[PDB]
Amino acid sequence: KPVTVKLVDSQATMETRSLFAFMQEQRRHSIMFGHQHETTQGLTITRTDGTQSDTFNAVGDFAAVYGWDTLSIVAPKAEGDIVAQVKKAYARGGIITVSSHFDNPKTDTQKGVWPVGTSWDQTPAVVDSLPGGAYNPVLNGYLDQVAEWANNLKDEQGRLIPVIFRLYHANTGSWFWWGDKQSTPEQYKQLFRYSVEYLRDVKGVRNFLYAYSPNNFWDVTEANYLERYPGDEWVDVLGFDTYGPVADNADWFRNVVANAALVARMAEARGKIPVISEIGIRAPDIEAGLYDNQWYRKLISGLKADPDAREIAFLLVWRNAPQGVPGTQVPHYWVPANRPENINNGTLEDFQAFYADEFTAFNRDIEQVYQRPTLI
């Protein structure tokens, strides 16, 4: 049966509209599992061509939601192209989401000593990147590349592949150049709206849903979420990002549930899709060799017991770095791998239990995502 949908892009493709409609329905029946770099990075994969994942090697199915970033789209594409892997994911009925770790438009010519010129260069660059600002052409080059990529992102029948495009995330912190010490709330909203407008109207992107994702609030109120919210005319997906402690984390898990509940209630009221766009044990704790072998079980149990938080469409965990990160090298991964270390520490069992849970949805559990009839 056709359902009526209201997207940021009133001219979005039918598959894009179908994706939205699919999540609207599915979200009250399951929570999909997402994973950054699902088929491009893994501790146990032997090909990064889009056909394998650590998730698959752990549980026998791929994540339903495949996360990537503009680090694979905008020059210099440090994370490498992903067109082929996105296409493989879409062909298996997966859902694609792309975040945006854009370089700093004010300082990107100064790259050399990390983090200068990157997302992590905290030099405020919002004011100088909006129209009238000296660095607006630099930001526009990024957006041009995102648009060209989207506009050519086609399946074997020549139809555009939908993508959930997540702009200027984690913006209630100040580690990025678009953060809260770097912009007034209005300036942040203008940056987000300008960017969406540029992609949709100036460049003609028709295969994006737009997500907004601040960090978790410890004072969980609608007013706090709304402070930097770009507005219902500009967002399709209401998310948030949260990273917690590996130990003594009950209060943190409660906060996860509270934030998920808030976005779920807001989403119902506003005609949006609520999600947890990033969640995980904080990287430093994993990098120190620490583990919580009940983490996934805690996550699913807490979320699905809550009548609001359970209504999220998906949650996504971060990348499984194949050789970790510079420490020597230290671990930096979120999906427990099918390997002796995760067998022995109990994390594999934890994840396998999460997979077995009736309420989680992996790629074979989602069907008919893109062929649902819709009205506007």
Ligand SMILES: O=[N+]([O-])c1ccc(O[C@@H]2O[C@H](CO)[C@@H](O[C@@H]3O[C@H](CO)[C@@H](O[C@@H]4O[C@H](CO)[C@@H](O)[C@H](O)[C@@H]4O)[C@H](O)[C@@H]3O)[C@H](O)[C@@H]2F)c([N+](=O)[O-])c1
């Ligand atoms: O609480 N905080 O302060 C906080 C929380 C979360 C943050 O970031 C979010 O969490 C994940 C995991 O920590 C973080 O992961 C990084 O992701 C980036 C992008 O994929 C990786 O950086 C890239 O790595 C490749 C290869 O090394 C390079 O080619 C790229 O140029 C780029 O440097 C990085 O290694 C991590 O995996 C994400 O950033 C996510 F938003 C942050 N925070 O500062 O980011 C703080």
Ligand code: NA
């Ligand atoms: Na759900």
Ligand SMILES: [Zn+2]
């Ligand atoms: Zn239903």
Ligand SMILES: [Zn+2]
């Ligand atoms: Zn994020």
